[PDB]
Structures are given as C-alpha cells and as structure tokens.
Amino acid sequence: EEVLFCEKAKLLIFDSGYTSRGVGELKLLRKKDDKGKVRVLCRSGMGHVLLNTSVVKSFKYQPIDADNENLIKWPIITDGKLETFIIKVKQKADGRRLVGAVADAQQAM
Structure with missing residues (x-):
C-alpha cells in the first residue's frame, strides 16, 4: 500500500447532533x-x-x-443504510487536498 494523503483528523458521527469519536492520523491508501x-x-x-x-x-x-x-x-454504508461521517481537519487547504486526493484516486480506479 501507498500513502496518498496523511493528516491528523477528528472523526465526527451523528448521535440521536454530531459528536467526536476520536482524533487520529487519517491516511488514504491504495494497494x-x-x-x-x-x-x-x-x-x-x-x-x-x-x-x-x-x-x-x-x-x-x-x-x-x-x-x-x-x-x-x-458517506458510508452501514447495514445498507447511507450515513455521513464528518472528517474534521485543522486547516482548510488540508480539506481541499483530501478532496482532491480522493477524486484523483477515484478517476484512477
């Protein structure tokens, strides 16, 4: 696997608002x-x-x-229902790059 992207991120998931589930290193990985x-x-x-x-x-x-x-x-599928997780990074250019890195990984596949 190659690392296409890597940043500290916070993962937020909806609870019946949105609440933090941990902070970690987020990597985008391709075989x-x-x-x-x-x-x-x-x-x-x-x-x-x-x-x-x-x-x-x-x-x-x-x-x-x-x-x-x-x-x-x-967006992620759990049990056939669509949910949206939120990935929070510190800076706004980091979000732009994550988006660009994912879109580029999707066109390549």
Missing part, C-alpha cells in the same frame, strides 16, 4: 498491485482504528460547503 483498492484508515497512542473503509466510485466526498472546506462529508 501497489491494484489501483481499484483504495481505502481510508484513521488510527488514534492506543492505535484504535476509528475508520477503515473503502472509497466507493459512486460517492462524492466533499466539504459540507464552501464555508467549511475543512469538514469533509464522508
């Missing part, structure tokens, strides 16, 4: 022998895996809006 196997891995000094999921060709991974470029909507 060296298979450009169609791309995943995100987010790992907190417990090394707790907060997120380990495939990038889906059919989903758009984009900021909440123009005003929050550092909060990326991460």
Whole structure:
C-alpha cells in the first residue's frame, strides 16, 4: 500500500447532533498491485482504528460547503443504510487536498 494523503483528523458521527469519536492520523491508501483498492484508515497512542473503509466510485466526498472546506462529508454504508461521517481537519487547504486526493484516486480506479 501507498500513502496518498496523511493528516491528523477528528472523526465526527451523528448521535440521536454530531459528536467526536476520536482524533487520529487519517491516511488514504491504495494497494501497489491494484489501483481499484483504495481505502481510508484513521488510527488514534492506543492505535484504535476509528475508520477503515473503502472509497466507493459512486460517492462524492466533499466539504459540507464552501464555508467549511475543512469538514469533509464522508458517506458510508452501514447495514445498507447511507450515513455521513464528518472528517474534521485543522486547516482548510488540508480539506481541499483530501478532496482532491480522493477524486484523483477515484478517476484512477
């Protein structure tokens, strides 16, 4: 696997508002022998895996809006229902790069 992207991020998930589930290093990973196997891995000094999921060709991974470029909507399927996780990074150019790195990984696959 190659690292296409890497940053400290906070993962927020909806609770019946949005609440933090941990802070970790978020990596975008592609298999060296298979450009169609791309995943995100987010790992907190417990090394707790907060997120380990495939990038889906059919989903758009984009900021909440123009005003929050550092909060990326991460749609994911759990039990056949669509949910949106939120990936919070510190800076707004970091969100722009994550989006660009995912879109580029999706066109390559």
